[PDB]
Write a protein that binds this ligand. Sequence first.
Ligand SMILES: CCCCCCCCCCCCCCCCCC(=O)OC[C@H](COP(=O)([O-])OCC[N+](C)(C)C)OC(=O)CCCCCCCCCCCCCCCCC
Ligand SMILES: CCCCCCCCCCCCCCCCCC(=O)OC[C@H](COP(=O)(O)OCCN)OC(=O)CCCCCCCCCCCCCCCCC
Ligand SMILES: CCCCCCCCCCCCCCCCCC(=O)OC[C@H](COP(=O)(O)OCCN)OC(=O)CCCCCCCCCCCCCCCCC
Ligand SMILES: CCCCCCCCCCC1=C(C)C(=O)C(OC)=C(OC)C1=O
Ligand code: SF4
Ligand code: SF4
Ligand code: SF4
Lengths: 110, 314, 156, 176, 43
Amino acid sequence: MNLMITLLTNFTLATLLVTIAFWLPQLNVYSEKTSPDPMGSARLPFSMKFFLVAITFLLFDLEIALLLPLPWASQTTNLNTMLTMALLLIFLLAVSLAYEWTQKGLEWTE
Amino acid sequence: MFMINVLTLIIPILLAVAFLTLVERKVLGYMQFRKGPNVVGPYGLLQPIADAIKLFIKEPLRPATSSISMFILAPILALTLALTMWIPLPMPYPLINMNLGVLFMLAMSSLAVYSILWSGWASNSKYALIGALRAVAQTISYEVTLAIILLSVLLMNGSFTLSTLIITQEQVWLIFPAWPLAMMWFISTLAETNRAPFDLTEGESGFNVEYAAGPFALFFMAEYANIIMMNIFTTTLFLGAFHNPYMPELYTINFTIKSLLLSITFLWIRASYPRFRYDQLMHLLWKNFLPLTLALCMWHVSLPILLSSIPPQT
Amino acid sequence: SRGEYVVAKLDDLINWARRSSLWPMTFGLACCAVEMMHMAAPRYDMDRFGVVFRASPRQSDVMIVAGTLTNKMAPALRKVYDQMPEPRYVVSMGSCANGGGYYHYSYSVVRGCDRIVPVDIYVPGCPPTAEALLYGILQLQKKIKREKRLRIWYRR
Amino acid sequence: TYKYVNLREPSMDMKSVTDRAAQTLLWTELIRGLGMTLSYLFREPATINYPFEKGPLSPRFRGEHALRRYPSGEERCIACKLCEAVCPAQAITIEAEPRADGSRRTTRYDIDMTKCIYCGFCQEACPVDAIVEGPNFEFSTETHEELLYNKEKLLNNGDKWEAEIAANIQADYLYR
Amino acid sequence: VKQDMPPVGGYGPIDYKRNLPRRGLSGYSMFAVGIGALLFGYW
Ligand SMILES: CCCCCCCCCCCCCCCCCC(=O)OC[C@H](COP(=O)([O-])OCC[N+](C)(C)C)OC(=O)CCCCCCCCCCCCCCCCC
Ligand SMILES: CCCCCCCCCCCCCCCCCC(=O)OC[C@H](COP(=O)(O)OCCN)OC(=O)CCCCCCCCCCCCCCCCC
Ligand SMILES: CCCCCCCCCCCCCCCCCC(=O)OC[C@H](COP(=O)(O)OCCN)OC(=O)CCCCCCCCCCCCCCCCC
Ligand SMILES: CCCCCCCCCCC1=C(C)C(=O)C(OC)=C(OC)C1=O
Ligand code: SF4
Ligand code: SF4
Ligand code: SF4
């Protein structure tokens, strides 16, 4: 409830400052501007490499999502299994990184 | 009474972001063998006020946006997420004392890339969109080492509670057992905030060049709120101060001095280095920081077990 | 009256804020760029006046035309001036920006940047010294100090 | 008579290899650069307080033009048009005639300060020290034609600045 | 005659080479200090 009050106050201050920044120089009557880019009119060229680094982020972020309950997982009484599976998840993130490395997936954005 | 506490959080945030600009211009002046602003106020103390009044009455660029709605929502989201990262910060007491304050901060900083993405697509320039996509890819790249370094540290905490992180560091700073985590963490916070040597939005046109000067000042102040916030979070995380529960202002003065020195360390790093080329900081993340971060993540998993130093849950 | 006093104080406020936070877009055309860089160098240091070093052209307050404007770059100067948000000002630095200068009778040189853009301060020299350029920027600040936007608005 | 920049083959023993690995992992040269920037943080800056403090000049300095006079009030310029013949930018326009006492004096002495390249060939062409390029550099205008000087403006600049111009010439005429 | 000239013995010597003075600890000592800080923190 205090969190909802705080989020509403932060959103209200942000929307207030955005409205002030968008409508305080609109009160000025400066001039109407006509004004008739490195690319001239060319279509946005797709690059496969930005999409590859975004998907690699998503996959390692899913592996991070698996890794996130470890500070609570260390409190278990099955510590040998917990330690084996923790090292195994970090090792599979490392093996995903190594396969992304050695098949030139981390190249020209290395 | 709680709303008074919310305003005494968020209004000094805006004032400290206002005067961080002056401190940056002065410290970068004296490191560049010149002075900084000292004409506008006494010792330049009215330079942020003058510059804010200048930017808020500067003409709008009045651009053609693909979306009006995302062109409005990108500064709103940037400012809101810049202000909500402060509310679990224990200093010595958080505003919102939540059990998962670390994970909340990690999530709300993961949501900050939509400001860059929506502001880049709202600009009709394809070059601004490409620069926005490069900034987003940089930021989500360094989020990986944020999450894993933060996890490896909190394996010594025992929980995601930020207030417990003061209790963790009563005998020693946590920079002593985790200085490689601390230095990769510090460079990853440097690369999250598009901060030099990782500022490719000023290397040769960024994502927000199509806004008016008012909303550009709002993006700028959200970015500096993120800078001060990540320095405070780094100070809580590795340089945790002494806390007397009968004298909380001792902790407040101590973490405030450490966070100021760390923000000035950001200022001093941008006054010292050339930029990375974009593939070079991708090389710095994916091929340097992430193997070390996985190795130290294995190490900080297995190390409380081999030393019998698993921290308490509660 | 009271409204006259209020628009006087508000003009003083907005003129203080605009002159005390001038942001230049410098056209580094020719030799005057070097002396602009000396006006930014630590001896003179424009940044202590609030005059930042290399603002981007979409957020700059003054356009310092520092060097020869050739005919091949006259529409580029005009396009950058058209992209500047108001209040925009133009400082003409040195003789080629002022009146063509040493290349006045050339086939390829715009005889002064005032044929392309409106010019507020003419800084003479070949090159004018960085102290003379800083003098011209302070004279531009005094020109902004005596602007009467809200007072003329209240009288219109 | 020459030297080889960057022709050092680095040592591959475990001492030097561990030194380079400690430099790579522990960022020693980055701390070196931070230390040099920190060392400038505590130096006094080189910033003078303009307008109250001025940059250093010399009596040879070539600033704003002036027409000079003799120590009797008579102007030195005897209309010989050497300054506009040597003028590399053709900034000087001179028309002359004999005045009412028959002296060879100008009736037009224009200097376009926006053609002028401030090289001072006119003051060294001048055989009577009439035109000088004086010490003033703070004469920026708000209008272009305020830099199109006629004879009246140049004579007023000479009357205004003669107390300084004469002492600069007194300092420098033995080098000329 | 009076002229801008060097003095009677000439000017003194002027340094013109590189002087990067080789400061800091060895690699062995720096890794030893860092590992010692790790061991102190772990203890
Ligand atoms: C939180 C408080 C502050 C924390 C400290 C930070 C303050 C100082 C910051 C200085 C300014 C930095 C600006 C940005 C610099 C970015 C560039 C950079 O540094 O890149 C990182 C560089 C990148 O490498 P590189 O690019 O220099 O080298 C070339 C790389 N290859 C070969 C791939 C082309 O180094 C690292 O990634 C190291 C990170 C930290 C490593 C910590 C290792 C700890 C010890 C492990 C064990 C070693 C001993 C052997 C085994 C012993 C077993 C018992
Ligand atoms: C947590 C704390 C945060 C603190 C943040 C701020 C720090 C710096 C504060 C300011 C320090 C002092 C600045 C003084 C500036 C100079 C003011 C002045 O004298 O202006 C003179 C001007 C013209 O006066 P005139 O009469 O014409 O002069 C001729 C005299 N023969 O007259 C005028 O311009 C009119 C009068 C203007 C006065 C303005 C004074 C400064 C306003 C600052 C506002 C914010 C202050 C902090 C607010 C929170 C704390 C209270
Ligand atoms: C374009 C749209 C506008 C964009 C700008 C604005 C939106 C973005 C910025 C704001 C983001 C809102 C985040 C809301 C939830 C945050 C997570 C959260 O609640 O964590 C805190 C805490 C968890 O910790 P814990 O201590 O375990 O719980 C208390 C138990 N003692 O949990 C609690 O303390 C629980 C408190 C009660 C539950 C709070 C629920 C809030 C309302 C629902 C979400 C509203 C926002 C929807 C849009 C989000 C962004 C898309
Ligand atoms: C609620 C409004 C608070 C004041 C606005 C933010 C604080 C003032 C910052 C001004 C500023 C400075 C000094 C500045 O140097 C700068 O350029 C890099 C900006 O970005 C455009 C700025 O916005
Ligand atoms: S006015 Fe003269 S010195 Fe200046 S840029 Fe032009 S040619 Fe070079
Ligand atoms: S200084 Fe040179 S360019 Fe100027 S008027 Fe004299 S001779 Fe002509
Ligand atoms: S100023 Fe000197 S050189 Fe020029 S016409 Fe007069 S006397 Fe001759």
